[PDB]
Paper text:
Neuronal nicotinic acetylcholine receptors (nAChRs) are a group of ligand-gated cation-selective ion channels that play key roles in fast signal transmission in the nervous system. On the other hand, the crystal structure of the acetylcholine-binding proteins (AChBPs) from mollusks, which are soluble homologs of the extracellular domain (ECD) of nAChR, represented a great leap in the understanding of the structure and function of nAChRs. Interestingly, despite the only 20%–24% sequence identity with nAChRs, AChBPs display a striking structural resemblance to the nAChR ECD, and their pharmacological properties closely resemble those of nAChRs. The α-conotoxins display a consensus fold with a central helical region braced by two conserved disulfide bridges.
To reveal the mechanism responsible for the distinctive binding profile and selectivity of LvIA towards different α3*nAChRs, we solved the crystal structure of α-conotoxin LvIA in complex with the acetylcholine binding protein from Aplysia californica (Ac-AChBP) at 3.4 Å resolution. The protein forms a windmill-like pentamer along a five-fold axis, forming five highly similar ligand-binding sites between two adjacent protomers. Each α-CTx molecule interacts with two adjacent Ac-AChBP protomers at their interface, forming the principal and complementary binding sides. Most interactions on the principal side were between the peptide and the C-loop (Gln-184~Tyr-193) of one of the Ac-AChBP protomers. Upon binding to LvIA, the C-loop has a significant conformational change that was also observed in the complex structures of Ac-AChBP with other α-CTxs. His-5 forms a hydrogen bond with Tyr-91, Pro-6 undergoes a hydrophobic interaction with Tyr-91 and Trp-145, Ala-7 displays extensive hydrophobic interactions with Trp-145, Val-146, Tyr-147, and Tyr-193, while a salt bridge between His-12 of α-CTx LvIA and Glu-191 of Ac-AChBP was also observed. In addition, the Cys-2/Cys-8 disulfide bridge of the peptide was found to be stacked against the vicinal Cys-188/Cys-189 disulfide bond of Ac-AChBP. On the complementary binding side, Ser-4 and Asn-9 of LvIA form hydrogen bonds with Ser-165 and Gln-55 of Ac-AChBP, respectively. An electronic interaction was also observed between Asp-11 of LvIA and Arg-77 of Ac-AChBP. Among the studied mutants, H5A, P6A, and H12A completely lost their binding capacity for Ac-AChBP.
Numbering used by the authors:
A (entry chain G), C (entry chain A), D (entry chain I), F (entry chain B), G (entry chain D): 0 to 206
B (entry chain F), E (entry chain H), H (entry chain C), I (entry chain J), J (entry chain E): 401 to 416
Write the structure that this text describes.
């Protein structure tokens, strides 16, 4: 049993060159999803807001496919996220380096599908003026590829509703709305689109 | 509720 | 004598590929235990509390067994934690990357048991409202594998009572109760269980 | 066609040696451009100002050229910044190590050109006295090679005008002017010139 | 606004 | 002689396997000593105190012995502490990761003796109540092996008086007494003793 | 003619083991010099002062010599400081790990001379009482080798005058005097001298 | 007790 | 003034 | 004294 897995990981990683990133010929679709845990700091003196969340990333590579029947009917395995290529999805308006709060371990399926969910703490630009009121305040931060256009990495969500079921029950803040929306952007110069997922969270201090 | 749990999400990518 | 140990380490590590983690076929039982040292910070403005503790981890691999009579009657040895596979146990509600306060050295015994106790400082979500009162306040944080279900990593404790014998005698806080309880979670969608150990501490400022 | 890319990177990186840096015989021109996002901290008690910006770097190496028709008509690809030589451009008046807020990915084209845009957070020396006034305040910070003279790395700009189109709309500070200016300096002792790009931003608290 | 976008900037070095 | 030294290090490091640590059969004696520089922070709101000190370590390995006459009469040499095995001495009551303020370079002598003195900044648990008084206050922190029993690493000191000759003359605090005392702990279950060195410092705000 | 440079580094670094450091057989002289930029923080509650400066270090190794006309008349080259041996000069009274603010690249010339000037931020022990007065206040911090005696690393300066030409014009502090003085120290135990460079700066709050 | 000491937990497990 | 600039300082160690 | 200086201790481990 363990023999199959040791053999499988060897054939995928050592037997092959590493996936060189997508192109226009061999594009790649990445599905993104957020699970907010808590808004842990709000700084009105700098307009900086801190989130703790789970970032779900799922993509599919053909170079990661294998036949379960050739490897002891193994359909999936777990491996360090450093061992594999990962997409360059970034919050465009972060103000400090994202802090990783979880292990960075990816799970590969025999169809070449990969799911990767690092827990992270993010500080980003947001004027919280109005948080201490009934109306609240809205913050927004876009996530997207840093160097890949829409012709090379397709971004999309499974739902527009942010997962709020694990938000800390006794947090200092109440979530009024939280959405994750796929957006397409074109520029007059250029035919290729540029895609982002707009994370929009409306919240207020809780009384 | 599975789709909120990190380990649960990955073993069921067809649901989450 | 000392030559034997180098040979033992050779046969276990450089002979075999790295243990690739458990599988549903070959599950693994991990024993969890905490020895709480101190509650070192309470931030009521952000609902963030800092603990300093020892996290005792024990598991058993068949691939690390050896015959004592075959290696100069050596029954145990110490080795760097990077050298061996270690479980991805994580506090689910941490707010900052865990800080390690100790060397990361594991001790392996000839029956395949490994025990590993990193000292750590953890910031996690807790509303401390009530800490300066007679009733005190309770904080809780769940620990479990990040990517392995219960069918792959079995979580177990040796006692439901947290070790408080090393709690700082002159701490700013008094421990009212400290328990470590195994919890199993099931989801309507899915057959496999998901296990966590709930560390629940009730405490108050010292009067 | 994905195979074509893997082969290209092999010939350029794995078969060729890494570019050892410029020389007086074979000098190098670097194009610099800044896209300011936000002024996120101003400390009048320490005379320290924190910027979040994109630093666009561009240069051209002959040793990275290839013929597209020889590689499946591939004209460009994206690759980690660690894989290639990068210029030692430095803020001369920084007060803390620069924090990288983005992936570090450069894109190489078949003519040998490389473009690289890391997002960064920089703390640098500036007395902000007057930021709460109508005139505002001016800060300056120089960027240039640390060890290469002007005879080895030529610094230049495509425009004297910093890109402010992505500046945070709800920032605590209003930008009055933001320019990026090439400067050349000579010293009586020495024939070689020393080049820097002067980032000068005038700003004030928002009315 | 292309030249302000990191991915767009690089895909058009002839404009940016 | 520079050729001799490269050969000496080569023969010692590249030929033999890495020293695997001491054993119950082949134990090790470590001499520990402290040179206190300054008490740079006292935090009464969290009961955390920061020390700046020099920590002198000393041990002797057979695997690091050599004959001077085969190596150009070289009797001792300098080496990075990563190149050789170092003991796992840790402050048992630390609250933050220790900060190293000096190079980590050890000197080995031909008799197998090694001396290693990193300067360090340590935050540890201490209730400072009484620091602004005439009696002062006492803090204590134990140092000892994390994973080695007394049958495997023997701890000791050359003197019990902490070296105060380099204590900062204009520190905010005056040192009343500072001792470093070897303490032994036994458990009924187990034959091996567990050894720690108790660093006890009494001090007060200077007046 | 990039080849000459490519060839030179090859012969110096890979065709030989790394320079093992100085001895008493092959001693070394290190030239030290400071260019002060700013006094960026003064903490009267902890006696901690933060400087940002350039530290110029110069030394000469015979093992780094080459013939220019044998290498395309090349007289000098730049390389990362990790590639070459660097001296262990350290401020003896720092209180936090020194922060490096510049690239770490040294330039070696065909005569074997090496120059290395890292920009750094240093927190060190200093009682700032009197900074808000007319007389000002004096801080002192010694720099010297951590593990090498005066018989192995000879310290020296080119001027007893700190370079103040790059001091920030709008700094919160005014420099009254800034000196860098070679000091020789002997101890009754030991014949060999121990050398340090005393950086003594007199300064005050600016009015 | 022994089951509180980091070196003692591991050396003698059958107990901790 | 050369010896005050890091790049100028290093390219002329004979003067600085 | 010597036993306080980092370079001095290690060159004389017999006294410190």
């Amino acid at each position: 049993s363990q023999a199959n897995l040791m053999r499988l990981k060897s054939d995928l990683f050592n037997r092959s060159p590493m996936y060189p990133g997508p192109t226009k010929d061999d594009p790649l679709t990445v599905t993104l999803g957020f699970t907010l845990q808590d808004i842990v700091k709000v700084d009105s003196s700098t307009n900086e807001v801190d989130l703790v969340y789970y970032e779900q990333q799922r993509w599919k590579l053909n170079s990661l496919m294998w036949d379960p029947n050739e490897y002891g009917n193994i359909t999936d395995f777990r491996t360090s996220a450093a061992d594999i290529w990962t997409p360059d999805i970034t919050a465009y308006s972060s103000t400090r380096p994202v802090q990783v709060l979880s292990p960075q371990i990816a799970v590969v399926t025999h169809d070449g599908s990969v799911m990767f969910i690092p827990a992270q703490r993010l500080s980003f630009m947001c004027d919280p003026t109005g948080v201490d009121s009934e109306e609240g305040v809205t913050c927004a931060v876009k996530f997207g590829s840093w160097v890949y256009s829409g012709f090379e990495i397709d971004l999309k969500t499974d739902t527009d509703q942010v997962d709020l079921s694990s938000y800390y029950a006794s947090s200092k803040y109440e979530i009024l709305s939280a959405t994750q929306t796929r957006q397409v952007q074109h520029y007059s110069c250029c035919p290729e689109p540029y895609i982002d997922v707009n994370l929009v969270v409306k919240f207020r201090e809780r009384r | 509720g599975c789709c909120s749990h990190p380990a649960c999400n990955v073993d069921h990518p067809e649901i989450c």
